[PDB]
Design a protein around this nucleic acid. Structure first.
Ligand code: DGT
Ligand code: CA
Ligand code: CA
Ligand code: CA
Length: 341
DNA sequence: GTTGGATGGTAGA
DNA sequence: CTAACGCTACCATCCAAC
């Protein structure tokens, strides 16, 4: 069983660089401008030239422009990146129809039938890298292992423009030597709970009773980790089904005023609903980010599917209920649909 | 007890 | 306006309901 994971390098900024090759070689920061004020918003991605100066996904545009004034700052054109991505994901389908598109820029390919071994996998990895470079001039990092998790870990270790096989033996080495924080699904919160438990490595999750581990990081994560540590993890490459579609916007300024907020919400509905495309949601959540950036949400799951009209009406009620059960001003308002029929 | 929805936490794209 | 986007997936947990 062999999983080839592809993660496009600095995706958004690279697409920007491919569209505008005069950009390659200098810092490119792809930004999501919130609109509140001059350069309000956050960096979506920066190329590695920008990253060398700490401009990375998540920092405020003004921080980025503080630490990297000269860079090229480009609005995020998510649809453009999605088009390139889909073309690449299609390229990847020509290597394995058994593909899991995990995000805009990463897929797992089960290549067990395409390859007999890690060496052919590697060769396929190179082939895959070249095809995407030929077809889309996008460099990608390839991570090959016996499962998704380690293929992702392989890729993280090889980024950018890398290719890395974690064979069955390194898998066993990494279960023992890899900081468990480096395991996908283990963020800062889980890492810092695993430290407390003295769990620094996947292997340490076997040296602990389930419930004590569970009682810290949760049943699912505990099982996950233990299954990884056991070299049993064998989650299949399954075609992903969007479970939720949503749209959230920053408001020009914070508001507790429904009438000022609604336009944003309805836009989020219009856009969410447009992006549902055929999919009928049974659940709608109005998500509000407050002044202090707490995320608050009120949702409803109807038996049957929600129409755009019912979305408009229910969202306003849910927004009503947010405004009512939380005293804070709302800074971002969004909607999220889910439970598709 | 246990579903499953509401809501939030966490991780990550 | 004064930093903190927007997006999804998964899961924990509370609580009402069954
Ligand atoms: N708006 C926004 N988009 C993000 C964020 N993080 C990632 N993305 C989008 C932009 C990235 O180009 C794309 C792929 O995610 P990655 O984590 O793989 O970032 P990227 O490819 O740019 O770096 P790469 O060389 O893997 O490390 O996902 C984020 O925090 N905000
Ligand atoms: Ca990634
Ligand atoms: Ca990437
Ligand atoms: Ca981590």
């Amino acid at each position: 069983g062999i999983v080839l994971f592809v993660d496009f390098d600095y995706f958004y900024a690279q697409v920007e660089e491919v569209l505008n090759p005069s950009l390659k070689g200098k810092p490119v920061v792809v930004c999501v401008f919130s609109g509140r004020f001059e350069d309000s918003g956050a960096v979506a991605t920066a190329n590695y030239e920008a990253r060398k100066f700490g401009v990375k996904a998540g920092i405020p545009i003004v921080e980025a422009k503080k630490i990297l004034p000269n860079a090229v700052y480009l609005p995020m054109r998510k649809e453009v990146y999605q088009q390139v991505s889909s073309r690449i994901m299609n390229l990847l389908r020509e290597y394995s129809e058994k593909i899991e598109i995990a995000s805009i820029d990463e897929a797992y390919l089960d290549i067990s039938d395409k390859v007999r071994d890690y060496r052919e996998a590697y060769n396929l990895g190179l082939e895959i890298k070249n095809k995407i470079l030929e077809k889309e001039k996008i460099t990608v990092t390839v991570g090959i292992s016996k499962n998704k998790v380690f293929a992702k870990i392989a890729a993280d270790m090889a980024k950018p423009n890398g290719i890395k096989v974690i064979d069955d033996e390194e898998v066993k080495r990494l279960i023992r030597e890899l900081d468990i924080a480096d395991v996908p699904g283990i963020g800062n919160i889980t890492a810092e709970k695993l430290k407390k438990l003295g769990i620094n490595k996947l292997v340490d999750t076997l040296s602990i009773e389930f419930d004590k581990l569970k009682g810290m990081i949760g049943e699912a994560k505990a099982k996950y980790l233990i299954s990884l540590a056991r070299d049993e993890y064998n989650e299949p490459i399954r075609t992903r089904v969007r479970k939720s579609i949503g749209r959230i916007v920053t408001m020009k300024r914070n508001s507790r005023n429904l009438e000022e907020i609604k336009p944003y919400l309805f836009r989020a509905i219009e856009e969410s609903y447009y992006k549902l495309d055929k999919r009928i949601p049974k659940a709608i959540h109005v998500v509000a980010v407050t002044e202090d950036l707490d995320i608050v949400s009120r949702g409803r799951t109807f038996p049957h599917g929600i129409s755009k009209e019912t979305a408009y009406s229910e969202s306003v009620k849910l927004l009503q209920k947010i405004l009512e059960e939380d005293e804070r001003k709302i800074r971002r308002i969004g909607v999220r649909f889910s439970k598709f029929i």
